[PDB]
Amino acid sequence: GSSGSSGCGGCGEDVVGDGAGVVALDRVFHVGCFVCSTCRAQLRGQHFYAVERRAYCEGCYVATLESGPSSG
Numbered sequence: 001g002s003s004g005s006s007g008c009g010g011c012g013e014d015v016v017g018d019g020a021g022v023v024a025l026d027r028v029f030h031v032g033c034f035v036c037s038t039c040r041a042q043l044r045g046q047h048f049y050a051v052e053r054r055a056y057c058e059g060c061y062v063a064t065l066e067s068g069p070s071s072g
Ligand SMILES: [Zn+2]
Pocket: 008, 010, 011, 012, 013, 029, 030, 033
């Protein structure tokens, strides 16, 4: 509501732009900051995954598997 504090988990600065901000993993990141951990692709608005408190784009998430079926 009225009270509350903002913040960008990525850089740290507050996230505000007249209706701007990417919420993921119970956190807030800037459209730019919010990106993959492998290819570091712009995930501002797309399908991604969550592994080890990280962000992996569908593409990567699928690529990582190739590595090996064992251990998930
Ligand atoms: Zn940021």
